[PDB]
Design an enzyme around this catalytic site. Structure first.
Site, mmCIF file in Angstrom:
data_model
loop_
_atom_site.group_PDB
_atom_site.id
_atom_site.type_symbol
_atom_site.label_atom_id
_atom_site.label_comp_id
_atom_site.label_asym_id
_atom_site.label_seq_id
_atom_site.Cartn_x
_atom_site.Cartn_y
_atom_site.Cartn_z
ATOM 1 N N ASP A 184 -2.894 0.830 -1.064
ATOM 2 C CA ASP A 184 -1.497 0.408 -1.280
ATOM 3 C C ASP A 184 -1.084 0.264 -2.744
ATOM 4 O OD1 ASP A 184 -2.604 -2.034 -1.927
ATOM 5 O OD2 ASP A 184 -2.065 -2.992 0.028
ATOM 6 N N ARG A 238 2.896 -0.996 -6.392
ATOM 7 C CA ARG A 238 2.416 -1.603 -5.182
ATOM 8 C C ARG A 238 3.427 -1.305 -4.087
ATOM 9 N NH1 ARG A 238 1.311 -3.675 -0.856
ATOM 10 N NH2 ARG A 238 -0.062 -5.493 -0.501
ATOM 11 N N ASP A 276 0.187 -3.860 3.831
ATOM 12 C CA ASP A 276 -1.065 -4.376 3.300
ATOM 13 C C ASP A 276 -2.158 -3.492 3.853
ATOM 14 O OD1 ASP A 276 -2.611 -6.135 1.795
ATOM 15 O OD2 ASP A 276 -2.937 -7.498 3.489
ATOM 16 N N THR A 277 -2.820 -2.778 2.959
ATOM 17 C CA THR A 277 -4.045 -2.098 3.349
ATOM 18 C C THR A 277 -5.240 -3.031 3.095
ATOM 19 O OG1 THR A 277 -4.070 -1.059 1.108
ATOM 20 C CG2 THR A 277 -3.199 0.268 2.899
ATOM 21 N N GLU A 296 -8.743 -4.149 1.460
ATOM 22 C CA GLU A 296 -9.298 -3.885 0.124
ATOM 23 C C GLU A 296 -10.396 -2.854 0.331
ATOM 24 O OE1 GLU A 296 -7.932 -5.143 -2.704
ATOM 25 O OE2 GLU A 296 -6.516 -6.308 -1.478
ATOM 26 N N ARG A 301 3.412 -4.947 -11.467
ATOM 27 C CA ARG A 301 3.364 -3.740 -10.605
ATOM 28 C C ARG A 301 4.775 -3.386 -10.143
ATOM 29 N NH1 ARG A 301 -1.244 -5.363 -6.278
ATOM 30 N NH2 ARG A 301 0.424 -6.859 -5.870
HETATM 31 C C1 THP Z 1 3.813 -6.277 -1.722
HETATM 32 C C2 THP Z 1 4.068 -7.468 -2.624
HETATM 33 C C3 THP Z 1 3.036 -8.193 -3.130
HETATM 34 N N1 THP Z 1 3.356 -9.258 -3.933
HETATM 35 C C4 THP Z 1 2.320 -10.184 -4.407
HETATM 36 C C5 THP Z 1 2.066 -11.249 -3.299
HETATM 37 C C6 THP Z 1 0.545 -11.566 -3.442
HETATM 38 O O1 THP Z 1 0.320 -12.621 -4.419
HETATM 39 P P1 THP Z 1 -1.190 -13.151 -4.527
HETATM 40 O O2 THP Z 1 -1.971 -12.185 -5.515
HETATM 41 O O3 THP Z 1 -0.950 -14.551 -5.243
HETATM 42 O O4 THP Z 1 -1.926 -13.217 -3.235
HETATM 43 C C7 THP Z 1 -0.007 -10.180 -3.936
HETATM 44 C C8 THP Z 1 -0.662 -9.346 -2.818
HETATM 45 O O5 THP Z 1 -0.845 -8.007 -3.338
HETATM 46 P P2 THP Z 1 -2.228 -7.289 -2.957
HETATM 47 O O6 THP Z 1 -2.296 -7.094 -1.465
HETATM 48 O O7 THP Z 1 -2.203 -5.960 -3.778
HETATM 49 O O8 THP Z 1 -3.480 -8.181 -3.346
HETATM 50 O O9 THP Z 1 1.102 -9.504 -4.576
HETATM 51 C C9 THP Z 1 4.651 -9.570 -4.202
HETATM 52 O O10 THP Z 1 4.933 -10.556 -4.919
HETATM 53 N N2 THP Z 1 5.673 -8.869 -3.717
HETATM 54 C C10 THP Z 1 5.385 -7.773 -2.926
HETATM 55 O O11 THP Z 1 6.299 -7.162 -2.467
HETATM 56 CA CA CA Z 2 -4.109 -4.957 -0.191
#
Ligand code: THP
Ligand code: CA
Length: 129
Positions: free
Chosen positions: A15, A29, A34-35, A37, A75
């Site tokens: 993702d 991103r 959510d894929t 890890e 991102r």
């Molecule tokens: C997809 C997405 C993720 N995020 C943030 C939420 C999560 O915060 P946290 O890092 O505090 O958990 C994180 C999850 O992305 P990842 O799944 O790439 O880890 O990215 C956003 O803020 N907005 C979004 O649209």
């Molecule tokens: Ca992920």
């Protein structure tokens, strides 16, 4: 929403992908998914699926939603298309991502992706297996 040009720099995982957008390298991103890890079950398969989709594409486009365009890690937040096919939707339809991270005002394609998840789940694909 509007599709904008970008070019592939490098696949990262299921993702996230690194694209050149308005001439600048950025990590994107994928919105609304959510894929797993890479270290988790189906993580390698998700990474592989996105990599194949973006590397094979003649044309990559990034489509921003109405809200936040960058997350707290810097991102880009977008729907990413490969030769007109949405990566986000394709991952969900194949059971390689769950619909997730649905925040108010960046959720234009929510119902489209939930419909894809329902169908992957009915089919018992990958994550739903
Ligand atoms: C997809 C997405 C993720 N995020 C943030 C939420 C999560 O915060 P946290 O890092 O505090 O958990 C994180 C999850 O992305 P990842 O799944 O790439 O880890 O990215 C956003 O803020 N907005 C979004 O649209
Ligand atoms: Ca992920």
């Amino acid at each position: 929403l509007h599709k904008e040009p970008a070019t592939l720099i490098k696949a990262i995982d299921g993702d996230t992908v690194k694209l050149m957008y308005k001439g600048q390298p950025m990590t994107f991103r994928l919105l609304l998914v959510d894929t797993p890890e890479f270290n988790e079950k189906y993580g390698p398969e998700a990474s592989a699926f996105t990599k194949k989709m973006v590397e094979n594409a003649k044309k990559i486009e990034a489509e921003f939603d109405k809200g936040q365009r960058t997350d707290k890690y810097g991102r880009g937040l977008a729907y990413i298309y490969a030769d007109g096919k949405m990566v986000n939707e394709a991952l969900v339809r194949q059971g390689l991502a769950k619909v997730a991270y649905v925040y108010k005002g960046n959720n234009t394609h929510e119902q489209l992706l939930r419909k894809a998840e329902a169908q992957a789940k009915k089919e018992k694909l990958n994550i739903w297996s």
